[PDB]
Design a protein around this ligand. Structure first.
Ligand code: MG
Ligand code: MG
Lengths: 313, 101, 314
RNA sequence: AGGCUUGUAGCUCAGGUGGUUAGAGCGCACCCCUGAUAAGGGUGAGGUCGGUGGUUCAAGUCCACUCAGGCCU
């Protein structure tokens, strides 16, 4: 007897699928595209609005504003539609007409900012929209809100621990906001008490800011094709005391691993998914990780990215 | 205070900064880099696709090389060229930081 | 402790969500878009291959042929990629570039017929490929294979019955192949023994084939836009004994109800999902259905229908 | 014979007190860019710093002698 009241409550319980033809048969893939807007972002777009309801700041009459150009907009769109709220998403003019049709047909009010300014133009437009009337709008701040890692501390951590039966030894996840890695690492290492877990972050080789942050070097980003990860800085959700290893992945091996994962596994996967699986592969080329159970996070599906360069001919 | 005079290395760095800002820090190149990051690139005139992301990585690596050529110099014109290169790097990074998430 | 062996075993267990702003609060949606290739067909494309493995006809060294390009082709593609078999999909050449990229990315072989004949040419080409070398090829035959209602009797029916705690009254399902309606109506009326269930069938008004078959008329189909349902004939997999009502839904009602469902409940829906919710709303106009639990199948999302007439608000 | 002054990448050349080994312009190879040319950027190959010694913690740079070229002679 389980009838969900709205579609925001249907998050989680994603399958953990053993990859048989990629690697040695010990890479385990947690398919996060089995979410109601088909991303890993559905967790945080539900929990940030739930936390805003619980701390009393989101009332009837308070609208939601967020600068985003990725899957967080789709997540906030379906949760604002399911729970009866309003949403204005600020984003640059560069992004496609298909993402705009999906976000407008799901209920959002798109504010298209100037494309040469780009992402901080979107952020500044969201900030003046909020500061015109601060008791009417609400800013979620996905790179600093602790709902973003506590949803992963309270949902996907126990799912990995109850699917692996506690036999997880290497956890591998890409870092866009850093909430997934810190939530899973905090649940396994602190709450349940397995301090031997190797938390590995996946990063682009064209913007390796986590490695530059761990080494002590200057943080200095660049452009890359692995979309979803590689923010260009160290967000407040990312906790570098939980990161035991970082692996950089180039764009072409990420795309080729996504195409391998589709063609040999049947899992529809994006570029970040292939990047994380390729990090698992070039970690398994070391001999000490031959008989380790490796759990890897596959955030999105490749059908979301169908008109892009993941599909050549 | 002993103000210095430039080498040919620092004058080459200043001319590189100015030409790189004039020919590669256009609005069209930032549009093209943001189009390359979210998949779909801008096509050729005869079949194929352009590559603005490699060009922007080259532009960033050039501006950083000429910025760290010019830190501890004391000529004011060298400092103004360092400021121009720093502003172009901040323009690109503020166009790219947080995009796609 | 559940580690799945491949992605074909992860089918089912799709959530049952209440509709709050459509109807009176007694429409219950079965969102079948939360399957591993995001459709209702993931169940049947896994089960027909499992059944062909158990019957012994799908040996190692056997290729699969099916004349389709819709959700069933994507389902057969991901199951044949997960389990390790070869698939040859036959489709007319008027099909979009992006669906062909999605099918080539899953490792399928696309044999293209001409655009003059269309689906009959795709079926004839599939039959010629299987008749070339019958010991290597195998048709799955989605319209006449009992694995198609077998999977909905063994998975979907128990899910609806265990989530509603035995309180279902009306079951709306759109009939493209007649498998989900037959399976759930065979589990609830047959196994659990609830004959009071009203199983209605959604078809287009441009192709009212089930109504013409139940009224004893001549089958004359027509072109329509609600893709997924309205095959143009009565398949061998839909049994007409378990169909109580037939509700005809026009194209505009399906588009508008799918848009309404996306922007009022956050459920990413396609044209058939809007047709089924529109049939539930057309059935709640009568006074006897105002306090009956309605379970409605939502089989696809608006990701696939992104270049269609469903998204025309720019 | 004396007094002076040159020699550094394929060519023309700067090198501030002895401190990244070593740099610029043109020339060469590869990539992006201009439909293309000019304009413009990135990576690299390329250096007994005329030769032999001395001094210094450290020599292209400071000394001592030679090799080759320019001025009064
Ligand atoms: Mg340009
Ligand atoms: Mg010379």
């Amino acid at each position: 007897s389980k009838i969900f009241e709205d579609n925001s409550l249907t998050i989680g319980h994603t399958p953990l699928v053993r990859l048989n033809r990629i690697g040695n048969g010990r890479i385990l893939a947690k398919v996060e595209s089995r979410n109601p807007s088909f991303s890993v972002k559905c967790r945080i777009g539900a929990n940030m609005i739930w936390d805003a309801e619980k701390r009393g700041v989101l009332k009837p009459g308070v609208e939601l504003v967020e600068p985003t150009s990725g899957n967080t907009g789709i997540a906030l769109a379906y949760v604002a539609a399911a729970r009866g709220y309003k949403l204005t998403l600020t984003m640059p003019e560069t992004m496609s007409i298909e993402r705009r049709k999906l976000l407008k047909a799901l209920g959002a009010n798109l504010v298209l900012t100037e494309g040469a300014k780009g992402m901080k133009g979107a952020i500044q437009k969201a900030e003046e929209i909020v500061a015109s009337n601060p008791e009417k709008y609400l800013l979620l701040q996905q790179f600093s809100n602790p709902a973003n890692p506590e949803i992963h501390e309270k949902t996907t951590g126990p799912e990995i621990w109850e699917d692996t039966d506690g036999q997880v030894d290497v956890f591998i996840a890409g870092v866009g906001t850093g909430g997934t890695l810190t939530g899973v690492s905090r649940y396994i290492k602190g709450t349940k008490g397995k301090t031997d877990l190797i938390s590995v972050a996946v990063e682009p080789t064209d913007s390796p800011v986590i490695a530059q942050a761990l080494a002590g070097e200057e943080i200095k980003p660049g452009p890359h094709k692995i979309q979803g990860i590689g923010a260009g800085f160290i967000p407040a959700n990312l906790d570098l005391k939980l990161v035991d290893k970082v692996i950089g992945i180039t764009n072409e091996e990420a795309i080729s691993t996504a195409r391998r994962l589709m063609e040999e596994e049947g899992i529809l996967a994006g570029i970040s998914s292939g990047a994380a699986v390729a990090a698992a592969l070039k970690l398994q080329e070391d001999e000490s990780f031959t008989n380790k159970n490796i759990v890897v996070i596959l955030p999105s599906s490749g059908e979301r990215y169908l008109s892009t360069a993941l599909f050549a001919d | 205070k002993t103000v210095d005079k430039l080498n040919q290395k620092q004058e080459s760095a200043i001319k590189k900064i100015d030409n790189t800002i004039k020919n590669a820090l256009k609005d069209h190149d930032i549009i093209g880099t943001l189009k390359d990051m979210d998949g779909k690139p801008v096509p050729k005139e005869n079949g194929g696709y352009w590559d603005a992301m490699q060009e922007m990585q080259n532009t960033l690596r050039g501006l950083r090389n000429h910025a760290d050529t010019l830190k501890n110099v004391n000529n004011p014109e060298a400092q103004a060229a360092y400021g121009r290169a720093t502003d172009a790097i901040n323009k690109i990074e503020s166009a790219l930081k947080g995009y796609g998430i």
